[PDB]
Design a protein around this ligand. Structure first.
Ligand SMILES: O=C(Cc1ccccc1)Nc1nnc(N[C@@H]2CCN(c3nnc(NC(=O)Cc4ccccc4)s3)C2)s1
Ligand SMILES: O=C(Cc1ccccc1)Nc1nnc(N[C@@H]2CCN(c3nnc(NC(=O)Cc4ccccc4)s3)C2)s1
Lengths: 307, 307, 307, 307
């Protein structure tokens, strides 16, 4: 409807969330600790292609866990639901690495994302694999900003002892397809987490998922309907770490958060969004972003089961 | 759109699911073991009021766990989200009785339903409490069949040792509101499970939830929008026992199953349904009903994230 | 050897432990909250019959969990290792009520003691059952003080919601022998916990276990060698609540603590002891008693693996 | 007493256990699968130095987990109870890698042994560390057979994905002393597991523990009394994998089993023993060895709490 009046509300919601100074910027690597707690940006991209931005929407930041639903969508687009879910589950967990079937709980947890990473473009080397994913992300963003943080990659690889423990654990329990270089897969996993985006480019990626796989700025089909439906289902139940259950109840929208302070939000057949503010709460979610998401659903009535 | 052609498809889906002879009729009490495995009925009730039935849709059966979302909707309608969720959670579990906050995981598990039962019409005796719930269920069904099985009630009460263990456990951990007769609450809980419905009357109850709290045959407001949205959210993630996660992924519709073989299904702003076939699978869900639900979403594209 | 010099050391150890004012007297029932934190008594009874007492050794207090190894010894004496352990385990746990075989972990936990209680003198009523156990305890104490607290019994029964939850849970999982009145068994369980002893009489009970089932003051055989060996094994690994593992490592003696502040200690083929001080630590063990036990083993070198 | 008559009983017990053909020889590496299921040897070495052997007592086999109590005894001998237990627990577990304090449950589990390995001779390289342990083992065996299997070492290192997952997990949770080369510690761990012994030499090692740290054939003090007492306590409760609880109850002797089929058994102030038969049961313990241990305690009454 009237997009001009909608932007005035997005600005009001941005201003209300801006007053939330709580949270702690992630500091496990210097590449995250660097960031200012005052950084806050909201970008909207509708299914029709209408754009609106407010705040620090052109400052690049790492996708981190926000890439998990994207690399999962590529795996389903290329291999289908059946092949992918032979290796990874489709529901949240109650932490342990595997479920009762010796499979990672879902693609939104580290163990699940490491296994999904092992399914994408099997056979070729990591350089070709990375280019393949980058090309897919470029199409999803409509050729907008998609970069890479070598400093983040080197730091994640050097300090990722928990991810190496997950790696050897999955190797022991035969979780990867036959003939997988586990360490090479971890390198590719760290590379994908280090991919940089801005609120603006990432809002187009979420808009592609909100428009059934079609990019709203190019009209091009990037992902299959099967891939989008699966990704949105798992974003609705597993996207916000331990807050996933409460986010499904109070917000009810497919979303995915990252340690850099990003929250990739999808409003089915309406719009794509990307909120970003580095200070995270006890669950690891953006404080300003979680506040904004609660206000957006309460104002525009976007909830899955809102009449 | 064309309802006449839609019924032809409902009949085809009914006929396909009829060929599924697997499952085991519940036998923990004689009142359930009595039932024929061949009983199979599907009833539809749209938001506009259009009805269609196929099979054994007039044979009464107990709601059992299908009442859990209904008594939860009454609690939220009368007390609001905040009061209710001080006593019960809003997400599934990974079994234990309480979560990390000494609260039952969600209203769709026995411990959660026992606590919800303790919130409805506090102060009055069980006879007034039961009449209050029956009146609400009558309004939800549009004054259609809502009965009671005294044989089921007596049997559930005499053999419900697990529910008495849950009862004393919740009493020890101070889960009920101050001044609660725990045993009286268990009696009321067993009474609610023993309420009988037919596929036809129960399809109107699910249609009230699909029509934002308005009964499609009376036009009357039965439940508040807050109550309906909460009930549908928890039916989407906790309604099908251990199959809840897989049902959210493959079907993506608010539904609730019972040990009598019933599956109360809701299609938001479209229709209400009730499938019933006594033989249950290893998860405790109706074999014919689960098969029908998968076929319905694959044919009419009713999934939450289907474009 | 020289008993006169040994008593001087027992008095020194008593005086050192007396300075430990920490802990909290149990207050879940008024019958325990009543007790003074300054009460502290140590009684010794050697295998030869030599006695020594220091402090409040004639003030009666409830056995509480200190009765658990005693009622277990009666069950093995009458039914044998094989019959008893068909219903209860023989090792500690990592809380849940049952192990992977749907059996309580060991006889020193509430669920294990409730099941052991259901094996003693089956067939007769609770009045005959209680007299049978009291007669056994009298023989174990050499006809010394063995009383009963009706106030404790009434209070434990009225507030024992956790024990009723355990009771119905064991009934559901078919843990009791066929034809058991679960509620009657709980009544008998509460009665056994309410049996009163003094440090002096209880030291003779521990001396019977230290003298292979023979009472050191009467010379009479009370328990079979099979019963004593089993009881001592389980006291060594399960007797001190969550501190059992640390007590096995640092003290290495068969012991059992109770909520009244008692610690029934056994020194194989040497002596029986009973320490009592109502203030308990975070694990539920007597602060003065735990301190005394560590000092006794460090001074006299009584540890199981001390050369 | 009469050693000549005792050997006749050891031979009878050997012959009875020889008839037990059940079990499966470990096959995760070819170096274990190689072994014959018919291999069976029992060696005795008393505190006085009296020796007796029956069966395949001169065929070398890897210590494997039988080295865990030995390397733990060296750590306590050099660093004391307090320093060692800052890094590792002192009790069994209910599998997870760490306890509630982010410490491995006990030194008899892989995670506990890897951490113990990181405490021995810190500072020097792995070649000096290995020589230090070998020298200690030589003194414990009275200069008898102590060798090394390079084939086992290479195979354990190449296939030890579970141990590498444990390694990175302990590194993430800061379980090792500051400045530890985790991979170098894993190499040393694999080397210690690959040390070879015969029933004869290993019976002298167990006799040193049974003689309070003194080697019965040399009279030399190898381990401190504090080290021996701690090792024996943890062998009594954690030495037989998941059968530890049942072995403590029915046998009640400090013992430690290995995947090669060895069971290092200690009889305090009486004798040291080593039973070996490659076929293992579902718990990972030697079938012939477990049978022999039950018969030995039933015949000679060696149990900890046997009068
Ligand atoms: O613990 C928490 C939360 C928490 C977290 C941190 C600190 C404090 C509390 N909440 C609980 N709620 N209810 C609990 N106990 C129920 C009642 C008895 N029971 C069992 N009795 N026996 C059981 N046995 C098993 O669960 C083996 C099993 C193994 C395989 C297959 C089936 C069962 S559970 C389950 S605990
Ligand atoms: O078990 C199953 C399924 C299953 C079911 C039935 C039979 C067989 C398998 N799957 C697993 N996946 N991953 C597992 N282990 C990981 C790796 C090490 N780890 C921990 N190491 N230490 C831990 N410690 C804790 O979890 C205390 C704790 C307590 C309070 C707060 C935090 C932690 S978990 C967790 S197990």
């Amino acid at each position: 409807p009237d997009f001009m009046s909608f932007t005035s509300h997005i600005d009001e919601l941005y201003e209300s969330a801006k007053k939330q100074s709580g949270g702690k910027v992630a500091d496990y690597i210097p590449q995250l600790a660097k960031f200012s707690p005052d950084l806050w940006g909201v970008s909207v991209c509708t299914v029709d292609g209408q754009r609106h931005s407010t705040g620090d929407t052109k400052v690049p930041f790492c996708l981190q866990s926000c890439v998990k639903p994207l690399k999962y969508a590529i795996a389903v687009n290329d291999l289908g639901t059946e092949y992918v879910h032979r290796y990874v589950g489709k529901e949240p967990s109650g932490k342990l690495f595997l479920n009762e079937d010796d499979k990672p709980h879902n693609p939104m947890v580290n163990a699940g994302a490491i296994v999904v990473t092992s399914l994408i473009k099997q056979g070729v080397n990591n350089a070709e694999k990375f280019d393949y994913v980058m090309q897919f992300l470029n199409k999803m963003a409509g050729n907008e900003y998609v970069g890479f943080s070598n400093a983040t990659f080197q730091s994640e690889r050097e300090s990722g002892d928990r991810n190496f423990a997950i790696g050897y654990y999955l190797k022991e329990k035969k979780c990867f397809p036959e003939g997988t270089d586990m360490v090479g897969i971890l390198d590719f996993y760290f590379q994908l987490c280090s991919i940089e985006v801005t609120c603006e480019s990432a809002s187009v990626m979420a808009a592609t998922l909100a428009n059934g796989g079609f990019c709203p700025i190019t009209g091009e089909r990037v992902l299959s309907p099967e891939a989008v439906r699966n990704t949105l289902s798992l974003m609705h139940s597993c996207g916000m770490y331990d807050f996933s259950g409460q986010f499904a109840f109070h917000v009810g929208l497919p979303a995915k958060s990252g340690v850099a302070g990003g929250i990739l939000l999808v409003v089915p057949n309406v719009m794509g969004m990307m909120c970003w503010s580095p200070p995270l709460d006890k669950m690891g979610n953006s404080v300003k972003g979680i506040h904004f998401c609660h206000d957006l659903v309460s104002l525009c009535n976007f909830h899955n089961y809102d009449n």
